[PDB]
Design a protein around this ligand. Structure first.
Ligand SMILES: [Zn+2]
Length: 490
């Protein structure tokens, strides 16, 4: 309190000495002014505020109620601007010093500070009702002359308050939550605030676990014990408003547990047996997933699995009898076929490769080949990128046909003659380089499909990247691509 009053009256005296006894911002916007205008009552208001408020029949002062004689004509471009800049520099220095002081002195060790200090820290953030919007939130400003015209919630105070153990900081954050939901965030999208809180708690628990000196087995034992003794207690904080801190801690803990579990599942998929102890953790995860029906946890698990590894990971993971099926719901496995196809990632260009690839697919299933020509003739992005899309569509169609065993060697079933006639007729790709590339591609003699990769997972991605960079080089008549062309082809 003593140092806070020292900072406050130091700022007051500094401003008084700097700019002639008390520069004050605009009373309407309550923030630092742009293009300052000086009233006869030694008042500084914003140009926009004064132009939007002094136009009607209220030629007076919102602060001290003094009549304005003529107009807001006198503006000071010499003293007010420099004084405002100096006071802003001092206020930013004070804010940075205050945040550094609270970060260092208030959390030196594992002992929390007193109570009134935390209460004043969480109470100074507001600009509570003044006679005139009301009750804005600040970016840790010990002063009252800085606001924003929107209630904004940060997380620096919350994060710095979660550094200690969660057992002794629940009431303070609970009071802060009740304040925010009672005064600024009564009825709105509370999902954003809930996810902000849960992410802050994930960060805090990650800091606590990583910074500590403990082996992984102790944490695994505690996690398994919690999983095996977790009473649901879900219905307590569900319906519309109630969200206890304990519930948030529990869901954060299960988030961390399933994050690690997905990491371990990916590691098992890319590796050998799991040392007979990680298997117990995965079995506990499976029993937890099959015991509770809150399928959001498995949704998050598969989302994290896709983020770490990719869509192809779950695509191969969703087969028909692999001993890892508990990560799917009872409905996804029910109506999923064995004909899951690869992904047409070349849609980056936008609404042009899709049409040509659909035309190529229709020409593949049928015998007519005029559809791809019609699709090519009805689009922008001329000849270079046009032929790029055409040949990429042909490659992806032939790859989809070959990789799937049911329709292997499909073009050889009276369809390669159609594509050969299409190449012969249309002159859009009747260039020797494109012609020989297509001749290699159609009969699958290109030396890229036979990558002989034992993993057979990323080999499709590798071939896709190789053929895509080859297409970019072939269709790119650019000076920057000449060395790459020479490296790839000569
Ligand atoms: Zn203003």
């Amino acid at each position: 309190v003593a140092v806070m009053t020292t900072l406050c009256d130091c700022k007051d005296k500094a401003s008084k000495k700097f700019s002639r006894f008390g520069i004050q911002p605009c009373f309407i916007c309550h923030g630092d002014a742009q293009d300052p205008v000086c009233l006869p009552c030694d008042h500084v208001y914003c140009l926009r505020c004064i132009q939007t408020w002094l136009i009607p029949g209220q030629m007076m002062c919102p602060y001290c109620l003094t009549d304005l004689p003529d107009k807001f004509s006198p503006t000071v471009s010499q003293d007010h601007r420099k004084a405002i800049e100096k006071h802003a520099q001092f206020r930013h220095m004070c804010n940075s010093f205050f945040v550094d002081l609270v970060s260092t002195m208030c959390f030196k060790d594992n002992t929390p500070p007193e109570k009134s200090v935390i209460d004043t820290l969480l109470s100074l953030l507001f600009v509570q009702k003044e006679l005139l919007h009301r009750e804005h939130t600040k970016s840790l400003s010990p002063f009252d002359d800085v606001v924003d015209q929107t209630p904004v919630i940060r997380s620096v105070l919350l994060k710095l308050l979660l550094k200690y153990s969660f057992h002794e900081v629940k009431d303070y954050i609970q009071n802060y939550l009740t304040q925010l939901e009672k005064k600024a965030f009564l009825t709105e999208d509370k999902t954003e605030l809930y996810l902000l809180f849960i992410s802050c708690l994930e960060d805090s628990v990650h800091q606590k676990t990583s910074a500590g000196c403990r082996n992984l087995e102790q944490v695994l034992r505690e996690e398994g014990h919690f999983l095996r003794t977790y009473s649901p207690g879900l219905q307590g904080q569900e319906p519309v408003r109630i969200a206890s801190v304990e519930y948030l801690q529990e869901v954060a803990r299960v988030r961390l547990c399933l994050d690690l579990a997905a990491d371990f599942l990916s590691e098992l998929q890319e590796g050998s047996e799991l040392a007979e102890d990680k298997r117990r953790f995965l079995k506990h995860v499976e029993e937890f997933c099959t015991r509770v029906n809150n399928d959001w946890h498995r949704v998050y698990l598969v989302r994290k699995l896709s983020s770490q590894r990719g869509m192809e990971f779950v695509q191969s993971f969703s087969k028909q009898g692999h001993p890892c099926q508990w990560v799917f719901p009872r409905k996804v496995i029910a109506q999923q076929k064995d004909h899951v196809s690869l992904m047409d990632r070349y849609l980056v260009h936008g609404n042009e490769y899709k049409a040509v690839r659909d035309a190529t697919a229709k020409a593949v299933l049928e015998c007519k080949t005029l559809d791809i020509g019609n699709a090519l003739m009805a689009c922008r992005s001329p000849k270079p990128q046009q032929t790029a899309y055409l040949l990429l569509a042909l490659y992806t169609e032939v790859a989809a046909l070959y990789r799937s065993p049911n329709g292997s060697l499909h073009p050889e079933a009276k369809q390669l003659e159609a594509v050969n006639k299409f190449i012969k007729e249309s002159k859009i790709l009747s260039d020797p380089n494109i012609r020989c590339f297509a001749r290699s591609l159609v009969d699958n003699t290109l030396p890229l499909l036979k990558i002989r990769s034992a993993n057979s997972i990323l080999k499709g991605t590798v071939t896709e990247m190789a053929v895509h960079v080859a297409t970019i080089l072939l269709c790119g008549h650019n000076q920057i691509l000449k060395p790459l062309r020479n490296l790839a082809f000569y």
